[model samples]
Target: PSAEEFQQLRKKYTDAGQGHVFAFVDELQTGERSQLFHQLSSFDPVRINELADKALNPPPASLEPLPDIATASILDSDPKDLEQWYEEGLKLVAGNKVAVVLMAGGQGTRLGSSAPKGCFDIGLPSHKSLFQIQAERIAKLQLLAQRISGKEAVIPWYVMTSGPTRKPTEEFFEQHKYFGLNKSDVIIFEQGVLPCISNEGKILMESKFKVAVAPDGNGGIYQALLTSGVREDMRKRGIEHIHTYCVDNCLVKVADPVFIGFAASKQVDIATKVVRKRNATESVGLILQKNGKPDVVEYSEIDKETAEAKDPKQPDVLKFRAANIVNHYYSFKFFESIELWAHKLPHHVARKKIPCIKPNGIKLEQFVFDVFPMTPLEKFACIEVRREDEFSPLKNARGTGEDDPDTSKRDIMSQGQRWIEKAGGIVITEGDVVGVEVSPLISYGGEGLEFLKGREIKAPAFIEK
Candidate 1:
């Protein structure tokens, strides 16, 4: 039994070369037919027409480096400035004006694990999962902010999961009992998914009962925040600022007070944390101003001259070196504009080459940084941090050379050792940086660790309580 009205609606897409999605409806079982019917019911002809039209007619790409435009940095700033900002952040966080969003839609397939990326074990002493480590950071932050403002504060965590990762992600969170966090404060939401487009600008059909679909990029967060009701949750909870970060960064300071403190003080629409590009030619985007409006230009768009040019005053530093690390602070005031941007944001494509079973399909998605261009130059800001301190992303498999499990694990342990060493504590260790670790719970980003001063600890230890 065909849907009485499906054919009329079906004709619209047929003209758009998306007719394949309905081709198998007659062949499918009742259960499968209903599923395909459901998919067809949600199709947006106008939106896909626009997406297909754009893919068919792409704009010309250009390249250039802006002059007299060095973004702001936290490095080399006055100690008093950081201290003031840090305190301000604590006050806001304590007053419950802060929340965090984790972009965890990505899977662990690249890392050779089928589980959610957040559940992957990075080999820390406790063998904590990615979710656990981040959860613990939130706990530590709550404790520190409470100590200062003497008020109860709970940082709301909004995690974004993809179509595929949602079930496993939710299962693992519940399994870990919300990673020692209050279940209510942790809000798990799903990001939007888009039908895959072909090179010929046609929607794709992947299965007899399903159309080819892909998780829209993290930029889809703008839309998901609204649709998932997470944005409303923030408003109802009196949140003023939101810290958003990718889940793969093992060293991410979840709900970082210093970042929130500085960015909120400026009252900017959005602020990002960047580190020096490993080199002029690293595969990272440069956060710069185009026509005096904040935007991020992908590395591929730049010419070698502009990419390799060094700053005249700071001879060693590259002129265009503020790299996007995907860690950002968004003022709640900016929330009003995101819904509009969600639809207007440009669609970028990723060619997924599965080689055999899944033919390469052009997946149109968005980038979280793509919204920067809409903000006024002064309203967009950046803070430069040291690469070693806080800029490692788990991108490759172990031994692919860099940004792997080994590196992330080592970086986390090295950070642990740095805190102890910074506090003038002795850490006797062996086998890389894996000894005498300080739990994040014990010291949220190395504060109040004065007890570590002149203290000595042997290897294989957790500095709790």
Candidate 2:
């Protein structure tokens, strides 16, 4: 618009108490002025007002805080049933009924990098990025499925990134040729950002020309799925199942067949992969029942005595021990049936300092698990996996804390060492007992690794074809 349009926008911002955003608009070059206005146009003043109001003065829940429901038994406890689940999962992948959705909206600043977290090198012997490792898993899994079916199989990958990581992610993928995956099969989608709000409900400006905003949250995947037309794409591809997971887990089994098969067999709308909580005081979310429906409750929400209560018959095992690891399976039909925008998920308040602005501001976020309760207990299920085999997330700074880069690197090496041993190979490390690394293309879950038998690997070794 021209001068009149600027006046109109100024009036709207002034009325909404965000007039400061436009205070320097007149000083901007023509292109910068357009950029600011375009960004502003994406905001809905009404929605901003409501979100800020709710964050500042949240309404109390109509019902009492829900009590934990009688727990469903973990499905993977019986070793004998694993073959069936694994076979069923393989069938789905081979028949082209399975796809993978990656939640990669996070940045790498916490890990001391400027790229997306999936692009960070966790110090694996192969020097592969997280994305490379995961993508190779998918490639190898597809091969397994095709070998069984005696036909071609494809596993489409859906990656969700935020505004800042979107371009860089795409560029990196292009540079690496998508880690040996078909470019078309790799669906890259962008998540939306929301305005940053002050305690007074006014929108803040990141700069003289830009508004401060953050990614809507991982839950934005639902909206992105619909708006990005991924749902229709799934329908066309006849993809019946989706194994969705975060990109940060170092030992994550990408599109884990056992998990997919277990969920498919249970005929549930949604299924979660979890690990046993180390202790009653463990800081993890428990995927138990909430008011007769399957839901997750953070450890902080449960009292110490309740968490400490042990099973009467099996005293060593906790009564509620299934801890969510952010890995899940969703049937496409069930995933397609819901409109989260109409039935909104809970909005969480995150208090943090906005780097672009001097003062601290409140950010609103919605977690992916917040939608788990939408499924009835009849259509929900859970399975427990060992933490050492599956759940190690890269979160903290390098070499500083437990969930840091080195920790993830060590876990990768340890998993490879274990796999090598299972295949009857000997691994000799220099000092820390983490000298071997297996490429996902060669071994996923330690199967088909018989070639390593009677073989010996020395320190800092990588296994690949």
Candidate 3:
């Protein structure tokens, strides 16, 4: 180790109030010892200094709602058109052209658990974890696709985990026998982390041996895909379409054929599934057009007046109310092309209450939605879906607020009841609660609902075909 190498770091520490580097130089002079390194060897002073400059200056903000094309709704399309899309999607799946990516980097800390969020059991009749339920759905969907296309299809499942979540998540999947899916088909990669900085642009240390760090937001999945060679795997498998979603969304359909078929048929490079917001003030991003291209604006960026604005033709509704549910589809070609202009993606700094050596620190993160504006106008599309059927998220702890286990379970039960009643079955309710739950393994999107007909099903029932 060279003493000159750590000159800058020593100065930083000394200026920040630290003792001398060596009081035992005389004692060690008997030996051939030269210098001892204090900080981590991986630390690059150039990178740290560059990040500090940007942290203090930051970037200017011109936050405004973008122009929007009216969202396309599935209800407005003909049943025959939807059937064609479904058939096309199944064919794509059977042809081994589809893949699913699960963004499971989040921890269950907010849910009052120490494990990964995907490992938290929602108390279903099967007592399945979120990861188990999603894995089963992927398996069932693959089978359906194979049955339709008359060919064996392999849907590779890619899971993005974080530093704190990677080990537990991998262990959970291992303990469950990889949820009946081929172990080789399940690929668990880790998302990157960024060090938190102080207002003065100094990197904060969590402990003497560790730096304060957080996951580099969901956008880090792009880097993970490239570095982990998952992108190369996609090319080898002939997987053209990738459906990515968050783990909190329990109702997510992996490799959703209809969505894939729709995007493929339209020749779109990217597509997103959206739902009309329940109200203007709902805590979700809105998919809109920026400079005649697709983009997203968070609720925090929009003011109350703009959020409450109404369309001239229909004064009863909010004009920009397409809730951006984190379900998206992208062509592998487009994802690969991102290497050309990946540097254009803007970095956003957030003042979070992060635990550190002194106190909370600011973390820099990049959003995946920012990629929308990076693409050409004709390549982007948005499809509006039914909120109740497609978007139920479990985010909070029990009895705290919305998106808790109780609310998530209730939503799942309600969805099953709706499907059962639609198929001519009665659901006896207890107050606001309905105790019927349907597993996606039996039916994906109510396909097996008809099997429940003529069965006077009771509460606390698990309907499996």
Candidate 4:
């Protein structure tokens, strides 16, 4: 709807005794989705059938289901061909349209900061913003296109931000000169917000205009990508592929070769970058088979019958591995399919803390990951990277019992530093590998530094800028 129409509708709804969510919804007041239906059941039968059906026949898993790939090959078959495959991957990307997407809608409260997570200093000496760091990675790939392939290539960069930090995010990018990357190619897009609910699914209100809320997690990426017209933007720019990953990870392997290689080789529609779990017992999803087709089964979802099996089978690998790093590469064709086939997916929901209007106050809910299995054509390649080489996810803002934020930070920094060192730079401290929380400065600048001679250091590490 046009802005004027939306404003008029909102005003009309307000006058009609309808609560139009204007700003924020607490997770507690506005349930993720299931809660929304439970509340709607009082008046909506369509929701009644949908909710009751799920209650009656619970599925075996919630992760996305994959249409069978004509062929899915493990690159290990000819490991030496990886570099060649990497080059080939670049060529494939170059020939097709490509765009880079980043999910940056989170705040740094968990990491002991109140600013946008992308802006927190993170004890970095240079005070680089997370936005800056991510831009560099995109720029690095651009250099790869130019310096190595001699292609004056540019990939559109799309960032998904939330209401609270959207302006700050845009301002930060403008302030930094877009971190040395071309301004035109860098695009910041905002994700839509759902109103928060209470236990009783009541809509909470902070004010007539705003409410407390949270980002809707990675699942929000679907709507964010399409609604922003980013998909169309990419197509117009001849970007046929899009790679997406979160902004939290200190070491995110954006457009990593193994992922790109596998996607290019399979020529499949959708793909994810996965890691080999230490064992089937690990917490992440195992990208394997469900009923003979590719799927991701979370550790919690598998029964003892399957988890404890000490044997290898087509569907079950006893040494079970394959975990999504959340870094994914998708063909423009598949993404277009999603836009054209929205009903193919039930609205995927996750439990979240939403700010809502209350008879009293706000609340949260226990939502499940139901949309992962919604896609009909998914080809996941368990692209293995060293835990130290590429695996750096900081999910636990503050680890507890057996883990903490320090531990998470250590993991991210360790992996990031490895990428730096492997490219031939020196590591001053092993802790430096983990403690060095890089800001937006050098992540892009250091790109193609692999080709630089005599120690191409740019700036000192930032523990917390």
- Pick the TM-score winner: 2
Prediction 1 global C-alpha lDDT:
0.80
Model 3 residue 174 lDDT?
Answer: 94
Q: In terms of TM-score, which candidate is stronger, 1 or 4?
A: 1
**Candidate 3 regions off by >4 Å?**
1-39, 42-45, 60-71, 312-316, 430-433
Please identify model 4 stretches exceeding 4 Å from their true place: 1-77, 93-96, 124-126, 208-217, 291-293, 310-318, 348-380, 397-465
Over all chains combined, what TM-score does candidate 4 have? 0.72
Poorest lDDT segment (10 consecutive residues) of candidate 4: 361-370
lDDT of 2: 0.82
Per-candidate RMSD, Å: 2.7, 2.7, 4.6, 7.6
- Candidate 3 residue lDDT tens string, 1-465: 455654655665555433232322344442322323433333454455565567567662343333343235675567786788889988989898999989998767888799999988887777888898899888889888877778767899999998789999889999999988999899999877766777765667665445666777787778778877889988888889999999999878778888998888877788889887657787778887755657887778778876788866557767776788899999998878867755655556778787754435677666888888876767877777887778889988888768888877877778887888889887776564466788888877777677668778777778764
What are the per-model numbers of colliding residue pairs?
0, 0, 0, 55
How does model 4 fare in lDDT? 0.55
Predicted candidate 4 versus true structure: per-residue lDDT over 156-251, tens digit per residue: 778888878788888888888887888888888887554344433334455544444445445666667677887778778877677877777655
TM-score order of candidates, best first? 2, 1, 3, 4
Clashing pairs in 2: none
Per-residue alpha-carbon lDDT of candidate 2 for residues 235-345, written as tens digits (9 for 90 to 100)? 999999999999999888988888889888888888888888758788887887766557788777777766787856558777777888999889997877758442477
Q: After superposition, how far is residue 85 of candidate 1 from its true place, in Å?
A: 1.1
lDDT assessment of candidate 3: 0.76
Better of 1 and 4 by lDDT: 1
